[PDB]
Amino acid sequence: ELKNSISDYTEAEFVQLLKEIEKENVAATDDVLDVLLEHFVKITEHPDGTDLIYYPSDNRDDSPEGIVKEIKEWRAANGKPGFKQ
Amino acid sequence: ELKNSISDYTEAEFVQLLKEIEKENVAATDDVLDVLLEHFVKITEHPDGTDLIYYPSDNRDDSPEGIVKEIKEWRAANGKPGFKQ
Amino acid sequence: ELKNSISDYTEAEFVQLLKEIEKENVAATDDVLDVLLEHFVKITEHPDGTDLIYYPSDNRDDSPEGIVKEIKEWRAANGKPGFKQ
Amino acid sequence: ELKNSISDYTEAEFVQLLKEIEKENVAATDDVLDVLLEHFVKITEHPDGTDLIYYPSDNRDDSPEGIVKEIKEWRAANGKPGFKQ
Amino acid sequence: GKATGKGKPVNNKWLNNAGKDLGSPVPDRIANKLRDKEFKSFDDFRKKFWEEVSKDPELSKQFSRNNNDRMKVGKAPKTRTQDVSGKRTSFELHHEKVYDMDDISVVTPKRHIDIHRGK
Amino acid sequence: PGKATGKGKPVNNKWLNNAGKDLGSPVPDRIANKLRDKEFKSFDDFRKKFWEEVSKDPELSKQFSRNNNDRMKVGKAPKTRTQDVSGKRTSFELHHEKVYDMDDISVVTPKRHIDIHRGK
Amino acid sequence: GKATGKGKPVNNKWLNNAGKDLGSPVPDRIANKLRDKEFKSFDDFRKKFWEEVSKDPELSKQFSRNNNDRMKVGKAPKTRTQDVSGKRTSFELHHEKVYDMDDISVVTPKRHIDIHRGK
Amino acid sequence: PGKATGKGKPVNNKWLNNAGKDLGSPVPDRIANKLRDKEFKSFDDFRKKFWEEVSKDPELSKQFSRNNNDRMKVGKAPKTRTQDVSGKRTSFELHHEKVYDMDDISVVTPKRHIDIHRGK
Ligand SMILES: [Zn+2]
Ligand SMILES: [Zn+2]
Ligand SMILES: [Zn+2]
Ligand SMILES: [Zn+2]
């Protein structure tokens, strides 16, 4: 379900949220996609927001796993709670 | 896919939209649901909007079939284009 | 997620599974629906299987809530584990 | 909606099908996924079936776009009908 | 081709005997809605047939909410568990003797198989 | 975190009919009996349990549509009528007159709720 | 109407300056695929345009997997967060002076607004 | 329920290339180091943790497609090639030669797995 924070999502669950966004990316319109994106921006708290998805750094894989890795390293470097474990 | 006019929906397709709304009705949050409801209100153009779904008149059935039937009759009665046919 | 037994589903989660089936009921084909139905039959262990959904007893409401009630009463009457609580 | 022939799918629609498969790829079980994969194998008619998805040749991109492109070229090369156009 | 035929009147248990003999007939009211209509194939007729059924107040009330939803999109209603046969779990249309509604009936999968088997 | 207390009040077949007036509708007594002495993690937890119990009460559930009953069953507040919404607040809200005292809790439409807190 | 125009050659950073001046031009190779084609509306042209982009190896490689998927179904790629404007979060096509590709450019929402504002 | 033990074996850039022969592919040593002394509820739990660790190992993950890496990331076994499937068994399976001893665990295709248990 759409939790409120990263701490409620296991790495696998977050990947499922990313694949849902990938599905809406190819939908006829962005009505649903943009709501899922706002949710993603909200819970990750990363300053670059959606860029993590649409403009991945060249220092990591452009994939659900790479997105989770970057978020994981950033949240750790900033003393914020990580994914559920 | 979310069209933008009732004339793009066959009665069957509209029922599918109503089923999607029922699924989100039971989802953890209303994030997606509310977007689907705005779309419904927009394309139907009925003054009572979401009431057709959540507050159906007693003179009709509380079902997807009843909702489509009432929209069909209301739109026809007001000279607006009907479902794709 | 598609758990293995009723004991893994809270009443609300089971209702979500029923609404997913309601959505597939109106899909173009029954490919996905029939898989969800087999899963429903498997975990409920009710002898009437899908009849609980498509041929509800007149002694209860033809609805997700009524389906959950019947399953709940039947599983209790047969000393089987109930929904997660 | 799941058609029954590649000729019913526009390239865009086929990508949506591939995205649905990617979403089920990360689902708890493969119940739905496997049904979507059988459909994919059936309509594509490519001898290597699901390999196009899970074991893409290196001479092409491992992406929905690459999958559609390879199917398109393989089908055309074998005189079979192409994507809806 | 075009749909022809009169069908027959049915009670509040139309498909009650769909698993016996040749099953249930096309309701007269339903035949009145489809008569003289053209269909690309029988499958198209089947879809239209079920959609018409869901619009008939007297017939629809004979089905659960989930089955009405199926018919509304042109799919056959699911039969009772006891009447299915393998992956065939929905009512089927049997041709007695392809658009003559007077030669068409609704049967369960189990009965349909028995019919073409001499039973 | 705390326990639910209170007796609530008796209601008829038009329970939320006045949720858009005064302090709104009270917690039904039958509902209070089912939640009394129950422990909740937060008020939000109470709210979910509250609506769920409403969906199980025959006399109350019949007062809502199929779509609204599905919402309550999973613990979400039922949608209000279009005329009673306020912006993105489109579902019934629980108001505290004076945290788990059911006799200080009532159901109000978002529109009415806003006016209550603004001296109206 | 029909699409006309030549467009211009672009590097491996085609939309690098979409948020400056009049943005990026229609790539010549893309103009070669759309030239002389008819479209019911500009929206149809926009959809075809993006679909063509996703098929161009040199251009597609300039976008992430998620953005290529968008273009593949005819939707504009999302811009960087810093370039959005309210609910306008995807690249937009600006008409300089409606199917003259030489008068069309790709701009970010933020820049597009500034353009029609004199900035 | 138990703890994972074993050292596993070194592997190259073609780890599962022989999963369809003999006893299949061994548990990679790097993977064994990450799972050693870890406690699991069941073997199925070990299997999930196993594939997840595989998805995090740079050298191993690069040996799979994007779609297969997504499967392993959530703990599901990667899909085998079409030619190595067996009916509804379309994903790599873990075989015990002699429950959590990683040196007795190997990865095999369903086709090969079946022949192993039938003296082949
Ligand atoms: Zn027959
Ligand atoms: Zn208040
Ligand atoms: Zn402009
Ligand atoms: Zn074995």
Question: What does R_g of chain E's alpha carbons equal in angstroms?
Answer: 13
Q: Who's near C44: CB < 8 A, 6+ residues apart? A: C6, C52, C71, C75
Nearest-by-CA chain A residue for B38: A31
d(CA H40, CA A27): 40
d(CA B46, CA E86): 45
| D-contacting chains (≥3 CB pairs under 8 Å) | A, C, G, H
Q: How far is residue E107 from each of residues E89, E118, H65, measured CA to CA in Å?
A: 11, 15, 48
- Both ends of chain E: CA-CA distance in Å? 31
Nearest-by-CA chain E residue for C46: E81
The CB density around residue G32, as the number of other CB atoms within 10 Å, is 12
Nearest-by-CA chain G residue for A48: G81
The residues that bridge with H79 in the sheet, in sequence order, are H91
Closest partner CB to B54 (pick from F65, F73, F76): F65
Asked if H107 and H21 touch (Cβ cutoff 8 Å), the reply is no
What is the residue range of D63's domain?
Answer: 1-85
CATH number for the domain spanning A62: value is: 1.10.1200.20
| Pairing relationship of beta strands G24-25 and G104-107 according to DSSP bridges | antiparallel
Residue G114 is encoded by which pair of tokens?
Answer: 């500034």
Give the DSSP letter of residue F68. Answer: H
The CB density around residue A75, as the number of other CB atoms within 10 Å, is 18
> Secondary structure of chain D: what % helix, strand, coil (to 5)?
60, 0, 40
Between vectors from CA G85 to CA G82 and to CA G91, what angle results, nearest 5°? 80
Best interface-test mutation with A: which of B1, B9, B24, B31 has the largest number of A CBs within 10 A?
A: B31
Q: Which residues of G70-86 are buried (b: 16+ CB within 10 A; e: fewer)?
A: bbbbbbbbbbbbebbee
Give Cα H23 to chain centroid, integer Å: 12
- What are the helix and strand counts (H, E) for chain A? 4, 0
List phi, psi (to 5°) of F59: -65, -35
Distance from CA of E38 to the nearest CA of B (A): 15
F117 annotated as ligand-binding: yes
Residue G78, SS3?
A: strand
Ligand nearest to the CA of F93: 2
Neighbours of ion ligand 2 (CB under 5 A): F 95
Residue F119 is encoded by which pair of tokens?
Answer: 């001296």
d(CA D45, CA D6): 9
Q: How far is residue D53 from each of residues D1, D9, H13, H28, measured CA to CA in Å?
A: 20, 17, 20, 25
Closest partner CB to G64 (pick from A21, A49, A54): A54
Neighbours of ion ligand 1 (CB under 5 A): E 94
- The dihedral built from the CA positions of residue B50, B56, B57 and B60, taken in this order, carries a sign that is positive
- Which among E91, E82, E86, E87 has a CA at the least distance from the CA of E112? E91
- Which among E15, E37, E41 has a CA at the least distance from the CA of E26? E15
d(CA H45, CA C54): 37
Sequence-distant contacts of H93-100: CB under 8 A, at least 24 apart: H94/H43, H94/H47, H94/H50, H95/H23, H95/H24, H97/H23, H99/H2, H99/H43, H100/H2, H100/H3, H100/H4, H100/H5, H100/H40, H100/H43, H100/H46
List phi, psi (to 5°) of B41: -60, -45
Give the DSSP letter of residue F105. Answer: E
Looking from the CA of E29 toward its CB, the CA atoms found within 13 Å total 14
d(CA D14, CA D7): 10
Ligand nearest to the CA of F114: 2
Asked if H31 and H49 touch (Cβ cutoff 8 Å), the reply is no
Sequence-distant contacts of A40-47: CB under 8 A, at least 24 apart: A43/A3, A43/A4, A43/A5, A43/A6, A43/A9, A44/A6, A44/A71, A44/A75, A45/A6, A45/A75, A45/A80, A46/A71, A46/A74
* Contact check, Cβ <8 Å, A15/H73: yes
* Contact check, Cβ <8 Å, G51/D12: yes
Amino acid at E71: M
- Both ends of chain F: CA-CA distance in Å? 31
Residue B42 is encoded by which pair of tokens?
Answer: 């927009």
DSSP chain H: -EE-B---B---TTGGGGTTSTT-EEPBHHHHHHHTT-EESSHHHHHHHHHHHHHH-HHHHTTS-HHHHHHHHTTPPPB--GGG-BTTB-B-EEEE----BTTSEEEE-HHHHHHHTTT-
* Contact check, Cβ <8 Å, B19/C20: no
Give the DSSP letter of residue D79. Answer: T
Give the DSSP letter of residue D65. Answer: H
d(CA C4, CA C2): 7
d(CA H112, CA B33): 48
For tokens 């709501």, name the residue. A35
How many interchain CB pairs under 8 A, A with H? 22
- The dihedral built from the CA positions of residue A39, A44, A49 and A53, taken in this order, carries a sign that is negative
The CB density around residue B42, as the number of other CB atoms within 10 Å, is 12
Sequence-distant contacts of A32-37: CB under 8 A, at least 24 apart: A32/B2, A32/B32, A32/B35, A32/B36, A34/G87, A34/G89, A35/B31, A35/B32, A35/B35, A36/B31, A36/B32
List phi, psi (to 5°) of G90: -125, 155
* C50 alpha carbon – ligand 1 mean position (Å): 25
Asked if H78 and H92 touch (Cβ cutoff 8 Å), the reply is yes
Alpha-carbon torsion, ordered E31, E32, E38, E43, to 10 deg = -30
DSSP chain E: -B-B---B---TTGGGGTTSTT-EEPBHHHHHHHTT-B-SSHHHHHHHHHHHHHH-HHHHTTS-HHHHHHHHTTPPPB--GGG-BTTB-B-EEEE----BGGGEEEE-HHHHHHHTTT-
Distance from CA of C14 to the nearest CA of D (A): 16
* E90 alpha carbon – ligand 1 mean position (Å): 14
d(CA G34, CA G44): 12
d(CA A21, CA A32): 9
d(CA F36, CA E51): 49
- Both ends of chain A: CA-CA distance in Å? 17
The residues that bridge with F108 in the sheet, in sequence order, are F93
d(CA C65, CA C15): 7
Write down the H helix ranges in chain F: 29-35, 43-56, 58-61, 66-73, 110-116
Closest partner CB to E65 (pick from B11, B16, B63): B63
Give the DSSP letter of residue C49. Answer: T
List phi, psi (to 5°) of E3: -80, 130
List phi, psi (to 5°) of G54: -65, -15
F95 annotated as ligand-binding: yes
Give Cα B54 to chain centroid, integer Å: 11
G94 annotated as ligand-binding: yes
- Which among A76, A16, A20 has a CA at the least distance from the CA of A45? A76
d(CA G1, CA F120): 59
Asked if A13 and A5 touch (Cβ cutoff 8 Å), the reply is no
Amino acid at F32: A
Closest partner CB to A22 (pick from D12, D22, D27): D22
Q: Who's near D74: CB < 8 A, 6+ residues apart? A: D46
Q: Who's near H4: CB < 8 A, 6+ residues apart? A: H32, H35, H36, H37, H38, H40, H46, H100, H102
Q: How far is residue H52 from each of residues A12, D21, H71, measured CA to CA in Å?
A: 9, 20, 9
The CB density around residue C37, as the number of other CB atoms within 10 Å, is 20
Method by which the coordinates were obtained:
X-ray
Q: Who's near E21: CB < 8 A, 6+ residues apart? A: none
Closest partner CB to F75 (pick from C12, C63, C65): C12
Distance from CA of E55 to the nearest CA of B (A): 8
- The dihedral built from the CA positions of residue C8, C10, C13 and C17, taken in this order, carries a sign that is positive
Question: What does R_g of chain H's alpha carbons equal in angstroms?
Answer: 13
Are chains A and F in contact at 3+ CB pairs closer than 8 Å?
Answer: no
Burial class (CB in 10 A: 0-12, 13-18, 19+), G8: middle
For tokens 């004339």, name the residue. B7
> In chain G, what are the domain boundaries?
1-119
Cross-sheet strand order for the sheet of F105-108: F25-26, F105-108, F93-96
Give Cα G13 to chain centroid, integer Å: 13
Best interface-test mutation with D: which of A15, A16, A24, A26 has the largest number of D CBs within 10 A?
A: A26
Question: Is G1-119 in CATH node 3.90.540.10?
Answer: yes
Ligand nearest to the CA of F113: 2
- Counting every residue written for chain D, the total comes to 85
Ligand nearest to the CA of G95: 3
d(CA E111, CA F15): 50
- Both ends of chain B: CA-CA distance in Å? 18
Looking from the CA of D46 toward its CB, the CA atoms found within 13 Å total 26
Query: What is the enclosing helix (H) or strand (E) of C27?
Result: none
d(CA G67, CA G85): 18
Distance from CA of D82 to the nearest CA of A (A): 21
Give the DSSP letter of residue F27. Answer: P
Chain C neighbors of D3, CB-CB under 8 A: 28
Residue F93, SS3?
A: strand
The CB density around residue G24, as the number of other CB atoms within 10 Å, is 22
Give the DSSP letter of residue D21. Answer: H
Asked if B43 and B57 touch (Cβ cutoff 8 Å), the reply is no
| Pairing relationship of beta strands F93-96 and H25-26 according to DSSP bridges | unpaired
Chain D neighbors of A22, CB-CB under 8 A: 19, 22-23
Q: Which residues of H35-55 are buried (b: 16+ CB within 10 A; e: fewer)?
A: beeeebeebeebbbbbbbbbb
Q: What is the CATH number of domain F1-120?
A: 3.90.540.10
- Which among H62, H36, H68, H59 has a CA at the least distance from the CA of H49? H36
List phi, psi (to 5°) of E64: -70, 165
Burial class (CB in 10 A: 0-12, 13-18, 19+), F24: buried
Specified resolution (Å): 2.0
Residue D55 is encoded by which pair of tokens?
Answer: 């074991």
Structural domain count of chain A = 1
d(CA F93, CA F90): 9
List phi, psi (to 5°) of E6: -105, -30
- Counting every residue written for chain G, the total comes to 119
Q: Who's near D45: CB < 8 A, 6+ residues apart? A: D6, D75, D80
For tokens 């229609």, name the residue. G26
Residue E111 is encoded by which pair of tokens?
Answer: 């009965």
List phi, psi (to 5°) of C44: -75, -35
Residue C35, SS3?
A: helix
* G105 alpha carbon – ligand 3 mean position (Å): 9
